[PDB]
Design an enzyme around this catalytic site. Structure first.
Site, mmCIF file in Angstrom:
data_model
loop_
_atom_site.group_PDB
_atom_site.id
_atom_site.type_symbol
_atom_site.label_atom_id
_atom_site.label_comp_id
_atom_site.label_asym_id
_atom_site.label_seq_id
_atom_site.Cartn_x
_atom_site.Cartn_y
_atom_site.Cartn_z
ATOM 1 N N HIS A 1 0.827 -1.213 0.000
ATOM 2 C CA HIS A 1 0.000 0.000 0.000
ATOM 3 C C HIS A 1 0.848 1.244 0.000
ATOM 4 C CE1 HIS A 1 0.099 0.233 4.578
ATOM 5 N NE2 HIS A 1 0.205 1.508 4.244
ATOM 6 N N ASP B 1 -1.049 -7.309 1.534
ATOM 7 C CA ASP B 1 -0.302 -6.052 1.698
ATOM 8 C C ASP B 1 1.180 -6.330 1.910
ATOM 9 O OD1 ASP B 1 0.172 -3.352 1.804
ATOM 10 O OD2 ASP B 1 -0.721 -3.055 3.812
ATOM 11 N N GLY C 1 3.246 5.828 9.135
ATOM 12 C CA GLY C 1 4.657 6.065 8.949
ATOM 13 C C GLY C 1 5.500 4.836 9.231
ATOM 14 N N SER D 1 4.225 1.739 8.423
ATOM 15 C CA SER D 1 3.834 0.713 7.444
ATOM 16 C C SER D 1 5.033 0.252 6.653
ATOM 17 C CB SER D 1 2.769 1.201 6.479
ATOM 18 O OG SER D 1 1.523 1.423 7.160
ATOM 19 N N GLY D 2 5.036 -1.052 6.451
ATOM 20 C CA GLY D 2 6.076 -1.729 5.697
ATOM 21 C C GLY D 2 7.204 -2.253 6.523
HETATM 22 O O1 LIG Z 1 -3.151 6.253 -0.693
HETATM 23 C C1 LIG Z 1 -2.825 5.075 -0.696
HETATM 24 N N1 LIG Z 1 -1.544 4.708 -0.451
HETATM 25 C C2 LIG Z 1 -0.479 5.693 -0.231
HETATM 26 C C3 LIG Z 1 0.231 5.585 1.087
HETATM 27 C C4 LIG Z 1 1.619 5.571 1.139
HETATM 28 C C5 LIG Z 1 2.282 5.490 2.355
HETATM 29 C C6 LIG Z 1 1.557 5.428 3.524
HETATM 30 C C7 LIG Z 1 0.168 5.459 3.475
HETATM 31 N N2 LIG Z 1 -0.576 5.392 4.663
HETATM 32 N N3 LIG Z 1 -1.725 6.135 5.032
HETATM 33 C C8 LIG Z 1 -2.131 5.730 6.213
HETATM 34 C C9 LIG Z 1 -1.247 4.711 6.666
HETATM 35 C C10 LIG Z 1 -1.324 3.931 7.914
HETATM 36 C C11 LIG Z 1 -2.295 3.983 8.879
HETATM 37 C C12 LIG Z 1 -1.936 2.994 9.900
HETATM 38 C C13 LIG Z 1 -2.475 2.562 11.109
HETATM 39 N N4 LIG Z 1 -1.887 1.609 11.801
HETATM 40 C C14 LIG Z 1 -0.762 1.030 11.418
HETATM 41 C C15 LIG Z 1 -0.141 1.405 10.241
HETATM 42 C C16 LIG Z 1 -0.739 2.394 9.454
HETATM 43 N N5 LIG Z 1 -0.398 2.970 8.262
HETATM 44 C C17 LIG Z 1 -0.307 4.538 5.658
HETATM 45 O O2 LIG Z 1 0.739 3.696 5.607
HETATM 46 C C18 LIG Z 1 -0.497 5.526 2.259
HETATM 47 N N6 LIG Z 1 -3.736 4.104 -0.929
HETATM 48 C C19 LIG Z 1 -5.102 4.311 -1.170
HETATM 49 C C20 LIG Z 1 -5.651 3.966 -2.399
HETATM 50 F F1 LIG Z 1 -4.875 3.465 -3.381
HETATM 51 C C21 LIG Z 1 -7.006 4.156 -2.629
HETATM 52 C C22 LIG Z 1 -7.816 4.672 -1.636
HETATM 53 C C23 LIG Z 1 -7.276 5.002 -0.409
HETATM 54 C C24 LIG Z 1 -5.928 4.819 -0.170
HETATM 55 F F2 LIG Z 1 -5.406 5.149 1.034
#
Ligand SMILES: O=C(NCc1cccc(-n2ncc(-c3cc4cnccc4[nH]3)c2O)c1)Nc1c(F)cccc1F
Ligand SMILES: [Ca+2]
Ligand SMILES: [Cl-]
Lengths: 58, 250
Positions: free
Chosen positions: B41, B90, B186, B188-189
């Site tokens: 993601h 993911d 932040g 994630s991954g």
């Molecule tokens: O925008 C999209 N990806 C780009 C992106 C890049 C880097 C990071 C993130 N990002 N945003 C929130 C969190 C995150 C919340 C959380 C809570 N707990 C643990 C770990 C967590 N991680 C995260 O990692 C998003 N996809 C997308 C789509 F393709 C379509 C619709 C909605 C969408 F979001």
């Protein structure tokens, strides 16, 4: 011995064989000891070990 | 990471920082000198695939200390079954343009055998999660690498204990429901790393779930064991032109 139980006594990886047989294996950068279970590093930076800590106890 | 501590420098040597145009994107895990595992993601919104950088040996983002190693990301491999903007499958496998050099500060995490991971690692209660993510829900990200010990739940238990994406066979829950401790945006991954008999292994990837450190909810992690074979096959394959590659899964 069986791998499902207590990891077959293996430190790392375990394979079941035909019969009452088991073989332990080690990840790249490790070798299997003559005990047939233990794995010892063969390289300076084997996976999954933390150098500053390994030294800290060396 | 919410409710953790600073990972002492060099104690999380497999941790990767992913940057896009110099900006923090996500974490990752080094599994070999040229291979990094992250979350699919993280790449949903990438425009210029050519501007992705992986940093190894990072610790304090405010400084340069000379242990850092930066590499271009040459390939981002995502399973066919992953749907952008969702949670299932993911996972991403990243090929670096040039290997990192292993040092006291740069070491891969072991990618375990599937059997071992399923039979043994899956039953180790506690594991470490790390990253430079938000220190609080709706809060600022960390300047120093953070780490947190979290307990794993059986999915049945997770579901029961929880109170909206499904928890699939390709996921697992870990953490706390009391809103005190979690991974966060932040992070994630990044790795969910599990210790067994003196060695650490990759068991999960920080995915994404119900805000962060939300009461009544647990962190959700990609169940790496489901992907071992897929990963291993790809690591044996020749690179292909163009950064993004969608690869059949299984
Ligand atoms: O925008 C999209 N990806 C780009 C992106 C890049 C880097 C990071 C993130 N990002 N945003 C929130 C969190 C995150 C919340 C959380 C809570 N707990 C643990 C770990 C967590 N991680 C995260 O990692 C998003 N996809 C997308 C789509 F393709 C379509 C619709 C909605 C969408 F979001
Ligand atoms: Ca630094
Ligand atoms: Cl391209």
């Amino acid at each position: 011995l069986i791998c499902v139980n207590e990891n077959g006594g293996c430190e790392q990886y375990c394979s079941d064989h035909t019969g009452t047989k088991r073989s332990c294996r080690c990840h790249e950068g490790y070798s299997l000891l003559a005990d047939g279970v233990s794995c010892t590093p063969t390289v300076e930076y084997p996976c999954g070990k933390i150098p500053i800590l390994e030294k800290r106890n060396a | 990471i919410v409710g953790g501590k600073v990972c002492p420098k060099g104690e999380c040597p497999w941790q990767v920082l992913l940057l896009v145009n110099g900006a923090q994107l996500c974490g990752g895990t080094l599994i070999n000198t040229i291979w990094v595992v992250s979350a699919a993601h993280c790449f949903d919104k990438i425009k210029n695939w050519r501007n992705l950088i992986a940093v190894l040996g990072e610790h304090d983002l405010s400084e340069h200390d000379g242990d850092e190693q930066s590499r271009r990301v040459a390939q981002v491999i995502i399973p066919s079954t992953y749907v952008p903007g969702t949670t299932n499958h993911d996972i991403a496998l990243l090929r670096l343009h040039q290997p990192v050099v292993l040092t006291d500060h740069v070491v891969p995490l072991c990618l375990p055998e599937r059997t071992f991971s399923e039979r043994t690692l899956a039953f180790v209660r506690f594991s470490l999660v790390s990253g430079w993510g938000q220190l609080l829900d709706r809060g600022a990200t960390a300047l120093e690498l953070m780490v947190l010990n979290v307990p794993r739940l059986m999915t049945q238990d997770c579901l029961q204990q929880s109170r909206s994406p499904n928890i699939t066979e390709y996921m697992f829950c870990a953490g706390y429901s009391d809103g005190s401790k979690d991974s966060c945006k932040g992070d994630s991954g990044g790795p969910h790393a599990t210790h067994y008999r003196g060695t650490w292994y990759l068991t999960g990837i920080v995915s994404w779930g119900q805000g962060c450190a939300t009461v009544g909810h647990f962190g959700v992690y990609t169940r790496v064991s489901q992907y071992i074979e897929w990963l291993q096959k790809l690591m044996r394959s020749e690179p292909r032109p163009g950064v993004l590659l969608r690869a059949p899964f299984p």
